[PDB]
């Protein structure tokens, strides 16, 4: 109720600011969607907390260790090992450093399906691309060989850094440098 | 029909509440139109607000009642329970029990074809955080001003009791308000779309000044309310009525705050470029009409706020679209 | 213990203090200095706890479509209709479905598949994640996005979560694998 009033005081002082918000619970979601100048569009959101924790562990149900796979990609962490740790413990570290990122594909993606840009993307640039967003515009996820890649569609990757996923914008093809060491991308002007 | 046995109000025998009881469906059946919504904020074990202050005036004997406003309550059960032995006399009521921000109570009760709804809460009124004191009332505001409807929204009329004057920026949008303006200058008060316990601390200085001032304020916002009937109501026994004498009926006729339109009619005359005083001469003369203000749209050019205009000077020019408070005896 | 067990069970618990990590499971030998997401509950996904949540604020304002994608698949699918429609307080309604919205009906899901039998166990006879990606991606769509394997290789039912493994990162017959499919 509290932070309710908060986003009805700062939309009222001026409607345009994108306000995020925190709710604790779901039903008080309804009461924000009531605002006259709530807008998803213009990026307004809640970050509900109760939605979130039951849905992450309801995914757990249906795939038992995806609540700690899906929020170890939400948050900033790094890989420091030590030599006191296990191997599994290295194993697992080295999955805790990731995270997901957006960028948009480079122009060499362009008419791939989508299929083939994540077997290109996979192999070649080291980096897991799992969604697109198709053009107003909708996300897509793993969609199937019927999506085209198209000019400045934006990726969803997961990768160790957002110094890794520029590497999707770099990549030429054979129009540049396009081989070998992952580190030999650079950028090209073709 | 019946009155109360001082011929002020209309009146019924009683009820029980299951009588006036009615269900989101069997409401929304029921045909509601120019009716008066209350949208009602309380707990079960909340203080007493006294409803039947609100309700009493609908219900005056000067109207006909064909002209009765019916009336619906949207809230708290348990709550109305307690307050119904007060309202059990009054015609053409009825109760929707939930919550008034749940937007199906709304629809059912057609909340856009109210002629008022009502924004008023029993909660604690000194509740610890000064911004949360209005929290239910401002959403129930925002919410009805956000709907919208098909064969709206901003467009339905609201009055809304605020427990702290200062909540009125958060009320209205298009406003521009400084939030250092006192209550009476801001948009929502000079529209009538607000009101606030604070403007009437100086009824105990103008009932020390002139009693009488404080007796003629009460016999218009009560409608009628004579100190018969508050000392009938002092007896206990409820508010006593049936069938009444021509003798005691004749009171029917007394004076009653209305408001007619200069877009038609035989006033519509001035509305097109003339002037108050022309108006408030001529309706006084014709008809008996006493004319004390107008209530102008804010957006002559398009919103459908309208301002209040207290006692406008003899040569202040009239739009079409202007309506006129007046005194009348019909 | 159950007759014709107990620890083999599967569980997931939330907590309200992430520090009570450290009394939920045995066998852990966890120093309680250690942070939630290192933890051996945490690391198996057998814990969670709000916390892990936090960091949903920045990433909703760095990048509005990620916490997007990230609720398209926590949720279901639960879009600004159905938050709209639920709304409107007259609870979820509902009945049979035209075959144009009745379309939506295939989405990605989060799946779980075993390369202990099927098509792919090929890869889990000592192939490498790469080999395995590549073939699943190509042949059914299946994009893959980490693996579940078991912690005691050698005797616990303990198993836990490697996000995105290298290319040349080996398989074993008993892992499974994360995946989003159509199917």
Not at chain 1, 38 to 55: F, M, N, S
Not at chain 2, 178 to 194: I, K, V
């Given at each position: 109720?509290?932070?309710?009033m908060?986003?009805?005081?700062?939309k009222?002082?001026?409607?345009?600011?994108?306000?995020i918000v925190?709710?604790?619970?779901?039903?008080?979601?309804?009461?924000?969607?009531?605002?006259?100048?709530?807008?998803?569009?213009?990026?307004?959101?809640?970050?509900?907390?109760?939605?979130?924790?039951?849905g992450?562990?309801?995914?757990?149900?249906?795939?038992?260790?995806?609540?700690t796979?899906?929020?170890?990609?939400?948050?900033?962490?790094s890989?420091?090992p030590?030599?006191?740790?296990?191997?599994?413990?290295?194993?697992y570290?080295?999955?805790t450093?990731?995270?997901?990122?957006?960028?948009?594909?480079?122009?060499?993606?362009?008419?791939l399906?989508?299929?083939?840009?994540?077997?290109?993307?996979?192999?070649?640039?080291?980096l897991?691309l799992?969604?697109?967003?198709?053009?107003?515009?909708?996300?897509?996820?793993?969609?199937?060989?019927?999506?085209k890649?198209?000019?400045?569609?934006?990726?969803?990757?997961?990768?160790e850094?957002?110094?890794?996923?520029?590497?999707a914008?770099?990549?030429c093809?054979?129009?540049?440098?396009?081989?070998?060491?992952?580190?030999?991308?650079?950028?090209?002007?073709? | 029909?019946?009155?109360?046995?001082?011929?002020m109000?209309?009146?019924?025998?009683?009820?029980?509440?299951?009588?006036?009881?009615?269900?989101?469906?069997?409401?929304s059946?029921?045909?509601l139109?120019?009716?008066?919504?209350?949208?009602?904020?309380?707990?079960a074990?909340?203080?007493?607000?006294?409803?039947?202050?609100?309700?009493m005036?609908?219900?005056?004997?000067?109207?006909?009642?064909?002209?009765?406003?019916?009336?619906?309550?949207?809230?708290?059960?348990?709550y109305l329970?307690?307050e119904?032995?007060?309202?059990?006399?009054?015609?053409?009521?009825?109760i929707?029990?939930?919550?008034?921000?749940?937007?199906?109570?709304?629809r059912?009760?057609?909340?856009?074809?109210?002629?008022?709804?009502?924004?008023?809460?029993?909660?604690?009124?000194?509740?610890?955080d000064?911004?949360?004191?209005?929290?239910?009332?401002?959403?129930?505001?925002?919410?009805?001003?956000?709907?919208?409807?098909?064969?709206?929204?901003?467009?339905?009329?609201?009055?809304?009791?605020?427990?702290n004057?200062s909540?009125?920026?958060?009320?209205?949008?298009?406003d521009?308000?400084?939030?250092?303006?006192?209550?009476?200058?801001?948009?929502?008060?000079?529209?009538?779309?607000?009101?606030?316990?604070?403007?009437?601390?100086?009824?105990?200085?103008?009932?020390?000044?002139?009693?009488?001032?404080?007796?003629?304020?009460?016999?218009?916002?009560?409608?009628?309310?004579?100190?018969?009937?508050?000392?009938?109501?002092?007896?206990?026994?409820?508010?006593?009525?049936?069938?009444?004498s021509?003798?005691?009926?004749?009171?029917?006729?007394?004076?009653?705050?209305?408001?007619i339109?200069?877009?038609?009619?035989?006033?519509?005359?001035?509305?097109?470029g003339?002037?108050?005083?022309?108006?408030?001469?001529?309706?006084?003369?014709?008809?008996?009409?006493?004319?004390?203000?107008?209530?102008?749209?804010r957006?002559?050019?398009?919103?459908?706020?309208?301002?209040?205009?207290?006692?406008?000077?003899?040569?202040?020019?009239?739009?079409?679209?202007?309506?006129?408070?007046?005194?009348?005896?019909?």
């Amino acid at each position: 109720a509290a932070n309710i009033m908060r986003v009805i005081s700062i939309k009222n002082y001026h409607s345009d600011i994108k306000v995020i918000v925190q709710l604790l619970q779901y039903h008080n979601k309804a009461y924000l969607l009531n605002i006259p100048s709530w807008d998803w569009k213009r990026g307004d959101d809640a970050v509900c907390v109760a939605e979130l924790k039951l849905g992450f562990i309801a995914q757990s149900c249906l795939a038992p260790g995806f609540s700690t796979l899906m929020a170890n990609l939400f948050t900033m962490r790094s890989y420091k090992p030590t030599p006191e740790m296990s191997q599994w413990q290295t194993d697992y570290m080295r999955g805790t450093g990731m995270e997901m990122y957006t960028e948009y594909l480079s122009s060499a993606f362009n008419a791939l399906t989508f299929p083939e840009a994540a077997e290109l993307c996979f192999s070649k640039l080291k980096l897991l691309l799992l969604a697109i967003e198709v053009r107003e515009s909708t996300l897509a996820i793993n969609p199937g060989p019927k999506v085209k890649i198209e000019n400045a569609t934006q990726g969803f990757f997961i990768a160790e850094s957002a110094e890794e996923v520029k590497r999707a914008f770099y990549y030429c093809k054979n129009c540049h440098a396009n081989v070998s060491d992952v580190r030999q991308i650079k950028k090209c002007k073709c | 029909r019946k009155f109360d046995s001082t011929g002020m109000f209309h009146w019924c025998p009683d009820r029980p509440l299951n009588d006036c009881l009615q269900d989101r469906s069997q409401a929304s059946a029921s045909g509601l139109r120019n009716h008066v919504v209350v949208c009602l904020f309380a707990d079960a074990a909340s203080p007493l607000i006294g409803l039947r202050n609100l309700v009493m005036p609908l219900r005056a004997s000067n109207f006909h009642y064909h002209e009765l406003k019916p009336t619906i309550i949207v809230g708290n059960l348990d709550y109305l329970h307690r307050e119904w032995k007060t309202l059990q006399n009054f015609p053409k009521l009825s109760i929707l029990p939930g919550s008034p921000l749940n937007r199906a109570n709304l629809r059912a009760v057609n909340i856009n074809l109210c002629d008022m709804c009502v924004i008023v809460s029993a909660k604690d009124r000194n509740m610890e955080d000064p911004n949360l004191v209005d929290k239910e009332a401002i959403l129930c505001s925002l919410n009805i001003k956000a709907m919208t409807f098909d064969d709206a929204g901003a467009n339905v009329p609201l009055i809304t009791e605020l427990a702290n004057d200062s909540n009125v920026q958060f009320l209205d949008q298009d406003d521009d308000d400084d939030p250092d303006t006192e209550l009476y200058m801001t948009q929502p008060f000079a529209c009538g779309t607000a009101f606030a316990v604070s403007v009437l601390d100086s009824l105990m200085s103008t009932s020390y000044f002139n009693d009488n001032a404080l007796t003629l304020i009460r016999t218009l916002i009560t409608g009628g309310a004579t100190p018969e009937l508050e000392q009938i109501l002092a007896e206990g026994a409820g508010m006593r009525g049936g069938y009444c004498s021509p003798a005691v009926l004749a009171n029917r006729d007394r004076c009653r705050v209305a408001q007619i339109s200069l877009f038609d009619g035989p006033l519509a005359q001035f509305g097109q470029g003339g002037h108050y005083g022309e108006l408030f001469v001529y309706a006084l003369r014709h008809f008996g009409i006493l004319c004390i203000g107008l209530y102008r749209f804010r957006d002559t050019n398009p919103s459908s706020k309208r301002y209040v205009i207290t006692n406008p000077p003899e040569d202040f020019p009239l739009l079409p679209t202007d309506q006129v408070y007046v005194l009348t005896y019909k």
